[PDB]
Amino acid sequence: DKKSARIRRATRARRKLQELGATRLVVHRTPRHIYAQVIAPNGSEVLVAASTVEKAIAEQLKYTGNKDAAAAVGKAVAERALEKGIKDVSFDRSGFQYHGRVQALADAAREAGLQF
Amino acid sequence: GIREKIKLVSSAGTGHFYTTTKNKRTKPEKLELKKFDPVVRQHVIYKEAK
Amino acid sequence: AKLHDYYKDEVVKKLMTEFNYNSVMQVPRVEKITLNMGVGEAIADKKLLDNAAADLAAISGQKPLITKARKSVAGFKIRQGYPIGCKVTLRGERMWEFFERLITIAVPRIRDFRGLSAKSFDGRGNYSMGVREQIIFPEIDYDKVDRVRGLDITITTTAKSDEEGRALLAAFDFPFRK
Amino acid sequence: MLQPKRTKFRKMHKGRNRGLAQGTDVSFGSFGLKAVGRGRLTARQIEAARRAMTRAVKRQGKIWIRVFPDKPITEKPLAVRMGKGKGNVEYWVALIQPGKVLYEMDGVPEELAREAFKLAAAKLPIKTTFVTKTVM
Amino acid sequence: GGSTRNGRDSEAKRLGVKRFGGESVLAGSIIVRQRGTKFHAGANVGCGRDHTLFAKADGKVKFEVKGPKNRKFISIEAE
RNA sequence: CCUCCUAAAGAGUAACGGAGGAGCACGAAGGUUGGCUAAUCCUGGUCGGACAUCAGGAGGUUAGUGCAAUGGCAUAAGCCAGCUUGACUGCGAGCGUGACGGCGCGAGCAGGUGCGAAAGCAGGUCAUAGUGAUCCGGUGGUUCUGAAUGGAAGGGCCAUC
RNA sequence: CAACCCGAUGCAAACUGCGAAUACCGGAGAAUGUUAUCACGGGAGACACACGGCGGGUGCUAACGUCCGUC
RNA sequence: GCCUGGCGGCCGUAGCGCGGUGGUCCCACCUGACCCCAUGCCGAACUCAGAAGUGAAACGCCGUAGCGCCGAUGGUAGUGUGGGGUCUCCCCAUGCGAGAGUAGGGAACUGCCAGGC
Numbered sequence: 001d002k003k004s005a006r007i008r009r010a011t012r013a014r015r016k017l018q019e020l021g022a023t024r025l026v027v028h029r030t031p032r033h034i035y036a037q038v039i040a041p042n043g044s045e046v047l048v049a050a051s052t053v054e055k056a057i058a059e060q061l062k063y064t065g066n067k068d069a070a071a072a073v074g075k076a077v078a079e080r081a082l083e084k085g086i087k088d089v090s091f092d093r094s095g096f097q098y099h100g101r102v103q104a105l106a107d108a109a110r111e112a113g114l115q116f
Numbered sequence: 117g118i119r120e121k122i123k124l125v126s127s128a129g130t131g132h133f134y135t136t137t138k139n140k141r142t143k144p145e146k147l148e149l150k151k152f153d154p155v156v157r158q159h160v161i162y163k164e165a166k
Numbered sequence: 167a168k169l170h171d172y173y174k175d176e177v178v179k180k181l182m183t184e185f186n187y188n189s190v191m192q193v194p195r196v197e198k199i200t201l202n203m204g205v206g207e208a209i210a211d212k213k214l215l216d217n218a219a220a221d222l223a224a225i226s227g228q229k230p231l232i233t234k235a236r237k238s239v240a241g242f243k244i245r246q247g248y249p250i251g252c253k254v255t256l257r258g259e260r261m262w263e264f265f266e267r268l269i270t271i272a273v274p275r276i277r278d279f280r281g282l283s284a285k286s287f288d289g290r291g292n293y294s295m296g297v298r299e300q301i302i303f304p305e306i307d308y309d310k311v312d313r314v315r316g317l318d319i320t321i322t323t324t325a326k327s328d329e330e331g332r333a334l335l336a337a338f339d340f341p342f343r344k
Numbered sequence: 345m346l347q348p349k350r351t352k353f354r355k356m357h358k359g360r361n362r363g364l365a366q367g368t369d370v371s372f373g374s375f376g377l378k379a380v381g382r383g384r385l386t387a388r389q390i391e392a393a394r395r396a397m398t399r400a401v402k403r404q405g406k407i408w409i410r411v412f413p414d415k416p417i418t419e420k421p422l423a424v425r426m427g428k429g430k431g432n433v434e435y436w437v438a439l440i441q442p443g444k445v446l447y448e449m450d451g452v453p454e455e456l457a458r459e460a461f462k463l464a465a466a467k468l469p470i471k472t473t474f475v476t477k478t479v480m
Numbered sequence: 481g482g483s484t485r486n487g488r489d490s491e492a493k494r495l496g497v498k499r500f501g502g503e504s505v506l507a508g509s510i511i512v513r514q515r516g517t518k519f520h521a522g523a524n525v526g527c528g529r530d531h532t533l534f535a536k537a538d539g540k541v542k543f544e545v546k547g548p549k550n551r552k553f554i555s556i557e558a559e
Numbered sequence: 560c561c562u563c564c565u566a567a568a569g570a571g572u573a574a575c576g577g578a579g580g581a582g583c584a585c586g587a588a589g590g591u592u593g594g595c596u597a598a599u600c601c602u603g604g605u606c607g608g609a610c611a612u613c614a615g616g617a618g619g620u621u622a623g624u625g626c627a628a629u630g631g632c633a634u635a636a637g638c639c640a641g642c643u644u645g646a647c648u649g650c651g652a653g654c655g656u657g658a659c660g661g662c663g664c665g666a667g668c669a670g671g672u673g674c675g676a677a678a679g680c681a682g683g684u685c686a687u688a689g690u691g692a693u694c695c696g697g698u699g700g701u702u703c704u705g706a707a708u709g710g711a712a713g714g715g716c717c718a719u720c
Numbered sequence: 721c722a723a724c725c726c727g728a729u730g731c732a733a734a735c736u737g738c739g740a741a742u743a744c745c746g747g748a749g750a751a752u753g754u755u756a757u758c759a760c761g762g763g764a765g766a767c768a769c770a771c772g773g774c775g776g777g778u779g780c781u782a783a784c785g786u787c788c789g790u791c
Numbered sequence: 792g793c794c795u796g797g798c799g800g801c802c803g804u805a806g807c808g809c810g811g812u813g814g815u816c817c818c819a820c821c822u823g824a825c826c827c828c829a830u831g832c833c834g835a836a837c838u839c840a841g842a843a844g845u846g847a848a849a850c851g852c853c854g855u856a857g858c859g860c861c862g863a864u865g866g867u868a869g870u871g872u873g874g875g876g877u878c879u880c881c882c883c884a885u886g887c888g889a890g891a892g893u894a895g896g897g898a899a900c901u902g903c904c905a906g907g908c
């Protein structure tokens with residue numbers, strides 16, 4: 001499955017980051033949406049999460065999952081994850097090739113304040 | 117054996133050198149590939165390898 | 167997308183009613199022609215193939231993919247590596263533009279043809295066929311050429327089964343036979 | 345006349361039997377010969393027993409052999425000091441213990457068998473006993 | 481004949497069974513070759529060249545069994 | 560010298576016990592980053608033949624590890640490609656293993672590197688064989704010594720044959 | 721005639737999808753033990769062991785045989 | 792609370808097979824592709840810009856026991872200590888007590904965030 005190969009294609013980093021035990025910024029992509037949540041070291045609880053399926057964000061959006069969309073998200077991710085205190089983390093591209101809408105929201109969260 | 121021994125001298129005037137081997141036959145060209153000699157305290161090219 | 171349009175056009179509906187397909191998706195879609203042209207020998211010259219490749223390219227505009235040997239286990243030869251092929255699957259536009267190159271001016275440009283064997287069933291409308299010889303279709307001043315040629319041609323349709331494969335592909339005047 | 349066509353290893357160690365077989369009750373024919381004793385079949389015996397066994401039931405009926413040699417067992421020549429590598433595999437033994445159902449008759453009266461095995465197990469070293477078939 | 485020869489010690493085995501004092505970096509489990517006879521985990525890992533279960537920061541030893549189809553896994557909890 | 564068994568479920572162990580291997584290979588077959596995943600069979604397809612190549616299905620470490628055997632490997636240690644030289648230098652908490660000489664594992668520190676967007680990884684190869692103490696000398700470096708003083712020969716120290 | 725496969729049946733020191741007793745390592749605690757324990761130093765002798773019980777290789781599950789482990 | 796997605800916890804009583812079912816919330820497939828990026832050929836995958844279409848496939852859920860899988864109780868095997876019979880094997884007291892097989896169980900369970908009703 002296209003989704004299957006994807007997962008295993010990042011299971012490594014998604015373990016090495018675990019090995020280190022550092023709060024990571026997980027990003028999930030989809031044909032129509034963009035997701036971003038900051039899970040804790042334990043990987044159990046999530047500290048913050050800003051996505052396109054959220055009315056607030058999507059409201060002032062031309063089209064969800066449009067790079068520009070997958071950018072404002074990352075910033076909101078940082079905005080939130082900062083007021084919460086969570087500064088400096090580890091980015092988990094999670095299968096997707098860090099290059100487009102992911103090479104955004106990531107650096108759109110980098111410049112936003114998040115350190116990594 | 118056949119795998120002849122080889123010495124990698126520092127490109128820098130320094131006399132420090134490295135040591136390793138190589139198949140004189142198969143690969144004709146002499147090995148060049150940088151390294152770090154304590155003296156200059158800096159990385160640099162290393163030549164000479166038959 | 168010439169022939170392509172025909173699909174979504176008169177085709178489909180026909181196949182639709184053919185077995186009242188539950189959805190406009192349960193409609194077996196033509197999925198990429200494949201081609202291949204077995205190199206053969208190669209070792210002998212390892213030259214005619216670079217040509218045979220250019221010949222494979224003659225038809226499908228896409229650049230040929232010189233297929234390398236595999237298992238190596240070959241009374242023939244094969245040393246794991248070594249050259250021995252040129253497949254080149256067919257994609258959308260070129261998939262139908264080519265499906266507008268034959269079944270019209272290639273298959274018809276016969277050599278005898280008294281009925282194309284409608285026997286290539288499998289379990290996915292998977293239909294493959296060998297041409298036995300470069301039909302001399304729009305190559306390049308096709309006269310000097312090289313000794314014979316031939317190749318393979320698979321359809322690999324999304325047909326749920328050859329119990330439908332036959333149906334589709336027929337929506338277009340597919341040679342075949344009674 | 346009966347041995348493993350092939351063996352990953354030329355010589356089996358030695359070890360020792362530890363009582364209680366596994367192939368107890370009959371599961372093929374309808375009679376058979378049981379253990380009642382401990383020991384090993386020289387394999388050259390299983391045939392000496394099988395042959396005589398057959399020759400009685402004649403042709404009629406089906407015979408079975410739930411035992412097999414498979415175990416090497418070497419022998420060192422006469423004049424030869426100790427410690428010169430293990431000897432050479434001279435014969436092939438078949439480790440059996442109390443319970444192991446040696447053979448198994450089927451197509452024949454419980455008469456032309458009880459006095460066929462009794463005739464058979466008389467070539468064998470390990471004592472024996474006749475067996476019926478057991479329902480359950 | 482033509483048979484004899486044989487390697488030597490190469491000890492290899494657990495040298496830090498169950499919760500131990502676990503020094504700043506004891507051995508724990510040598511058993512070379514072993515990448516999976518015992519796996520690296522927790523406040524200990526390393527898994528040196530010869531797959532020697534390292535054992536980082538000092539402390540009790542765990543010895544578990546998790547995901548990837550059972551798998552041993554050696555980790556060390558602090559005392 | 561290495562592998563398995565004997566070796567009695569920690570280590571360790573004998574025989575002229577049962578079996579095999581090593582005296583190497585590699586500037587990539589090392590490092591990193593991105594990606595990939597086999598054997599086998601079934602059906603269909605020009606020349607394609609039991610078995611080259613193409614399609615689909617089944618299957619799931621039965622493949623593949625540079626070379627023995629054992630353990631291990633999908634997060635692959637298997638396979639492909641880009642950029643590369645960490646096959647760096649000085650050290651090293653703390654350990655394992657040895658009668659000893661000695662061998663092995665090692666996080667982390669300092670200086671400098673390569674790859675990655677980054678966390679990060681890299682002090683050679685999936686690991687375990689692939690080796691020779693000492694002496695006597697050979698080569699290069701160094702202002703350590705230099706038999707009245709300055710030099711030099713010789714000696715020391717580091718690299719190395 | 722017979723490969724794979726299904727069912728039923730055995731065998732394995734160098735088979736294991738199972739798996740003890742127990743030995744071993746560590747932690748806690750009472751009692752008993754003339755610190756039995758550890759380290760450093762003065763002095764040694766000894767490196768031909770034999771039989772018996774248990775687990776084994778070798779031999780013929782021969783030997784007051786032979787070679788290991790253990791009491 | 793029900794449904795979906797993301798990250799996990801446990802890793803087969805969690806898996807597979809079979810039958811059914813769900814859609815502009817979500818998810819997919821899906822449309823377009825000069826481009827960012829990509830094919831040792833291919834927009835298949837990777838990637839971008841997104842309509843129109845469909846739950847077919849995939850995925851999720853529901854049921855079903857055909858197969859995996861879990862699995863007692865009893866007995867059996869072995870074994871530490873003490874004793875005994877004894878030609879290479881057993882037996883008794885005692886503590887421990889399998890493996891397989893049988894009864895049976897079984898179509899996972901759960902935490903955190905988000906979105907829809």
Ligand SMILES: [Mg+2]
Pocket residue numbers: none
């Ligand atoms: Mg041991």
Ligand SMILES: [Mg+2]
Pocket residue numbers: none
């Ligand atoms: Mg190796």
Ligand SMILES: [Mg+2]
Pocket residue numbers: 743
């Ligand atoms: Mg033991």
Ligand SMILES: [Mg+2]
Pocket residue numbers: 767
């Ligand atoms: Mg002596």
Ligand SMILES: [Mg+2]
Pocket residue numbers: none
């Ligand atoms: Mg002695």
Ligand SMILES: [Mg+2]
Pocket residue numbers: none
């Ligand atoms: Mg002795």
Ligand SMILES: [Mg+2]
Pocket residue numbers: none
């Ligand atoms: Mg004696």
